[PDB]
């Protein structure tokens, strides 16, 4: 599950990602949350095909992040490995693009 | 309160007593404003020489700059070509600002597109943005050519314009034979005139670099004219008119005067006139290439001399009397066409106007600013008129240009009290016109505030502004004026002498106090 | 609220335009540094007509352009030291400024500059409120993200500066005008009506706004929001934090103005309602005379476009439009076109007269009837 | 006292304290001046409506007229012919005043001679004066033609120009074949435009009346253009340029723009350009004759319709947009030439400027004065701009012209508050602008004093002057402007909108008082 | 003083120009009617820069144009009734005028109009000084007869008004400036020097002149005549009637100014001479600095002048080291643009500059001469390709 919040007015896309590493949730890649049906992505982990969906936090106020998690923007992903940067790009293109 | 018979706009509606009381209550109750005597003391300090010394020690802060960024000049250059869309690869806000700026200066529609680069482009680059933007622009506006510049975003993230355009052509987003010239225009380097130079060099390279084998200098018996960053349509028109009068075949590359002066007849024209692609392709076949504004056409000069093998003449901007004469002589020498009697008569009429107005013009002190070539041409014309430039400011000038202007000033007795400033903004010029008061300022609309500041010191300290340059926002249709050639010299002379006479009339309009000098004949 | 199609001609601004141009720039007693290259600050200088009262260059700096003027060295090696030196020079040359905002342009966030740390250090050193705004133009799809970032900066650096300060004497009729940028004096024309109603406009920002007014905003009883789109973030934040209710007011046209005045007065006691009735009665003849003068020459005209009510009050249909509310393109097409260009105010009863006169002037000008050459 | 570093002219030298004290001592000791409070009271009374009632009851006194005498217009008409000497049979002082007037307006040499009629001429006549003057003028200045007008002296004593010139030729003072056209120009009839009409009619009769037997209308496929009393060289230039653009063969009779714009090249040119005698002799062969200013060309129209058999079109002055359109359409119909795309584009550009500036031009109130045709053209253009010409004054207008202007005003919604005044002078207009204050006043330099008067009542009562008309003495090179055609309308619109903008900028330059509306963009 | 040759571009004016334009027009508190058609009044309106202090249209009327505006009926039937009605209208519309003059244009003396009787009748009725001037332009050969006629009118209608009045407090240092028309403030620059000498300038006309000053002129001890040509008649008449000596003063250039100041002070006691020496010492550094600044730029230049008696302007040109015989020519506006077309630097109206008289005027004169003679525009007459 990839967790993000898009503001209804400014369209500010903030991603709820673990503070340690990666962007996926609830575990490292090997609230009123609404699922985005049109978004689906599959990654071929050893011995299993794993789908990841998009959950959108509804409302106008960004909630404080839980422990071990942080709200980041696409620009803040600079320096992070390519794979989760591309995942964030796919989410951004589906939501903002 | 509004009376339907005499409706008041913001001025002087907010001068009404109720509005004055409400504003005073707002200021006293919640604004926590500094005391009025205190503001007066600080302003008087800002008008002093000590404040000028503190102001000229600035190294990191720029206040009221007198320059723009490169992609604006690139857009202006792109608008000068036939059915050409300016395309600034980068963020949309840049294009919005460019369009608003040129709309306010020209009071005309200004066409320009962006590929709307955003955070995703900040992370991954704008290759997909380039492909989609080129495809959509070609499909929607049907331009014959798309001239591509860059915003600071694409320059900082290191977007390869050539590779992006080549990949767009390869993947079928645009046809391979569709002309897409490009130029890197870093807004942190130079100014808008640098962007104009870069865009023109990119277009010329795109159209001529790979086809120089079949080019012979002088084949078409024409002269290439590169105007540079020019925001006076009258200058394009006067150059074309003078070349036509001389009987000289010419190619005015980047001619935007038609698209910036579209008639209002119930139909909107996105494109109008402009340099054709055939003219660009046939440009190396010209006898020579004359740069109207050489001091911001360095890259264009290098490309023309190193690729077209054109012996570009050492010509100043055709401004004033002597430099227009030199331009006409050089054109005559290159083309072999004698200067006709009509141009001689026009020069004589300009000399007659100078003789008629020299009494009012002589000894007048001017603080001026603008682009390097325009500023140096104005300084040369003022020296020709017997006027005294005192503060010559060019925010986008360099050391070599300053040395050339100093050499020009030293050659005239009227340049003794002249100082040339490069890299200084209009706050520096405000300090200069406070500490060393000139008679008048010559510059764009941004100088009006300076005038206001001078009027705050007192009527005797007020420096009136003369709106010559770019951008002029608070006046209408001044962009149609001419500053080049004898016609431009006459227009500038008339503006200067009539500004002097208007100021004198205002100063002598007081009945029984100063109206003894309110002469009917001046 | 999605990304615009690349390669299309759009009027969308950037986050810098939304933050510096709209929200932060009108604050008169503050100095706003367009951090980055010269272009963004130059094109936005005095572009918007956020009217203000002050001595420009001494205690007010709205129409001035403070910029870092980034060069290639600033891009390559960063501009944090340049920002600190610039802040020092600003304090030297403009002592009467009551605060500094640093509005980031596109390169600032791409070269890894930390303007938050510089702002904190310099504000602690100079005892000055320095507000870093991460309003890079490439962020977001329009000026809406600029509004959001500017509102967040207001909340984080300015709004809570008097949270523990109880020295402000409050009245039950304390209101704050939010989201009115005083375009041609719109906020003044709204404030005169509000204060004639017996209310005390403690805060009025951004238009003709002071930093002290922003700091005093959390001390008011009601938040009258003019532009919901740009200041809804701060309105909801104040509602949740300080428990201050907010309502949208529309003073565009006499009917909408009367309705909004009555709605605002309904929040307060009977005396405020009586004062609202007196204000409505006093201003009724003026806007009635405006209607009697201008509606007959504007009745039945079609407008192609909040602002509906004023058009209806002049008897104009709203949707071959006689008027379009991209100005020069429609001008070339020959349809009259109408931030207000060079006139105003248009809000309030005083603004309605100007609005009607301008609409009659533009719609009925003979220049629109001379488009066709008589020989064509 | 004077400081050599900054030498002061009369202003502000006489503002020095010693000069102020000396002037105060003079006034208090020997001038026996009225007390300042009484002067202020009388001025305030002169600004009132009752003073306007007294002023408009004037029957015998004229204060600050807005017209000149016939021989000035006759001299101007004579200056428009090739190598032609204006020769005013009468007193020398008239010619001196004519030359000084035209020198001050045009800032160019003006050739004109007088036969120095004196008391002996008052007793016996100026026949000997005519003979000697014609002989001396022909010997000294070698003109191809001598065009003879009259001063009030010769008209009052009743000198017969025809008999005098016939006796001069018969007795051998001048050759019998030498062209000596004449015209009686009584200064107590009409005005300077009437003198222009009389001179042109006399020249046309001299060159065409006796040789109409072989003349066929439309033989040369040209259109005669009579400009009338015109003091804008740009008007002649724009008429010629527009007719050349149309491809229309034309004959501009009385073309003085060449002799009034001689170049400064170290040589004095007594004559330059002008209508040739062959053009005048071939005028009846034209397809038609177009009168640019028909309201003071009545005698010329009668001669051209009665002798040349030309069906002179009923055309207004080509001023503004609609009347320029009608002039171009009539020229197209007469010549059979279509209106070219260049003129259509220029008209569309004028319409575009009108659309750009309509927000600032609409509803502005103007008090204007000048010659009848110029005034009515200006009124028509102002109505086309949505402006309100509240006070229309024409000292040399008549009842028929007033009826025509009233009909024009009734056809426009913007003429409701407009009043036409004929036979009134600038003191009447001063009363009008004091009692019914307009936003601006358009007129010659004589209006400046009125502006001064308004400024004495207060800054809020000041009515700024826009200098369009004749004569303009306190500004330089305004005679080169254009008021005819789309180009003239463009120049007028730019002048009006920019005058409004300078007035607004001056009214909003007060820091922290009115500078909230001191907008950069307007 | 002979008749100019007909048809030879004579530069001379008329009698009306010499009377209305020169002598009577500068009188600020009087209203001067150009009696006749409109042209003469229109062309002479504010033509000369006779500077004055006053509220125009209320108590001063110099730059105004009052005319009877003769029509055909006025020529056929006369304009005496029209003149009387015009005088009544002037009285009703300009109540603060302190006198009226009626300057005749050419038709007045030809249609047999009697303006003297109208003037006397209306002046008796209104208790106002009305001066009829028969300055018809055809009279004489130039403006000299106009000066003579205007001087005779002054003598016959204004000068002797206070003959029987002895209430004026007279001092031994009473002088009257005659013939200075205050062109650009020349009379003021002369008067400041005269009064700094301890003298009391009781009268100063026509320039910045009042009718009361003309009436007070017979009370002065000395008559300082600037322009001998125009006011020699009135000076001689005043000398033979009131026994007032008159002398010509030249304040054009520091040398002539010092000589004239000493000559004037020699007509009074030792205190006036001491004050003259003090004034000369005070103004010596200023004109010395002006000379040091401008003489090097003007040394050796040749001048020809055709404008008055000669040697009046020669002194100031020699004070700047400018030889007088060309690098500069001084004439009127009619020849100004002609000699400009020849390309010779050119300088009546003072080229809308001034004053040129006195020490303060010398600085302006030197600056103007340097500006015109050394202007670069004179070096650009030849096209560089020709
Ligand atoms: C009071 C004033 C004259 C004062 C005077 O006589 N000064 C004479 C000047 C001489 N002195 C006294 C000032 C100096 C000396 O002589 C000092 S000494 O006696 O020699 O010691 C008279 C004369 C002209 C009058 C105005 C006009 O009609 C126009 C108008 C008509 C309306 O219906 C009512 C208002 C108006 C404004 C009138 C008001 C007033 O009625 C005026 C100013
Ligand atoms: S701020 Fe907004 S686009 Fe609310 S970015 Fe835009 S000066 Fe508009 S509809 Mo230009 S949300 Fe203001 C606006 Fe409205 S610039 Fe002005 S007119 S009331
Ligand atoms: S009066 Fe004469 S033409 Fe003596 S008519 Fe003329 S203000 Fe001249 S050379 Mo103008 S005899 Fe005065 C004169 Fe000299 S008007 Fe002035 S400058 S010193
Ligand atoms: S989207 Fe907005 S306006 Fe654009 S840059 Fe970015 S913050 Fe600024 Fe700036 S200097 Fe010029 S105009 Fe740009 S290319 Fe850079
Ligand atoms: S010499 Fe002198 S200026 Fe000449 S008329 Fe005679 S008084 Fe007068 Fe007057 S109106 Fe015109 S300008 Fe004459 S023709 Fe008559
Ligand atoms: Fe336009
Ligand atoms: Fe000239």
Residue numbers in the entry:
A (entry chain E): 5 to 34, 66 to 132
B (entry chain D), D (entry chain B): 2 to 523
C (entry chain C): 49 to 353, 362 to 375, 417 to 422, 427 to 439, 443 to 480
E (entry chain A): 49 to 355, 358 to 375, 418 to 439, 442 to 480
From the paper:
Biological nitrogen fixation, performed by the enzyme nitrogenase, supplies nearly 50% of the bioavailable nitrogen pool on Earth, yet the structural nature of the enzyme intermediates involved in this cycle remains ambiguous. The MoFe-protein is a heterotetramer with the homologous α- and β-subunits forming an α2β2 dimer of αβ dimers. Sandwiched between the two subunits within an αβ dimer lies the intermediary [8Fe:7S] P-cluster. This cluster transfers electrons into the active site [7Fe:1Mo:9S:C]-R-homocitrate FeMo-cofactor positioned within the α-subunit.
The structure of the MoFe-protein purified from HCA-deficient cells (MoFe∆nifV) revealed an endogenous binding interaction with the protein nitrogenase associated factor T (NafT), of unknown function. Given the structural similarities between MoFe∆nifV and the alkaline inhibited states, we sought to determine if NafT can also recognize the MoFeAlkaline-inactivated state. Alkaline turnover reactions were performed for 4 h with and without NafT present, and subsequently subjected to concentration and S.E.C. before structural analysis. The cryoEM structure obtained from these samples revealed a 1:1 MoFeAlkaline-inactivated-NafT complex at 2.33 Å resolution with two disordered MoFe-protein αβ-dimers. Interestingly, both active sites contain identifiable density for the FeMo-cofactors in the resting state position, despite the apparent absence of density for the HCA. However, within the MoFe-protein of the MoFeAlkaline-inactivated-NafT structure, the residue α-Arg277 displays an altered conformation relative to the resting state and is positioned between the cofactor and NafT, blocking direct contact between NafT and the metallocluster. It is possible that NafT is indirectly stabilizing the FeMo-cofactor within the HCA-deficient active site through interactions at the interface between the α- and β- subunits, potentially precluding Fe-protein binding and thus preventing further turnover of a ‘damaged’ protein. We further demonstrate that the nitrogenase associated factor T protein can recognize and bind an alkaline inactivated MoFe-protein in vitro.
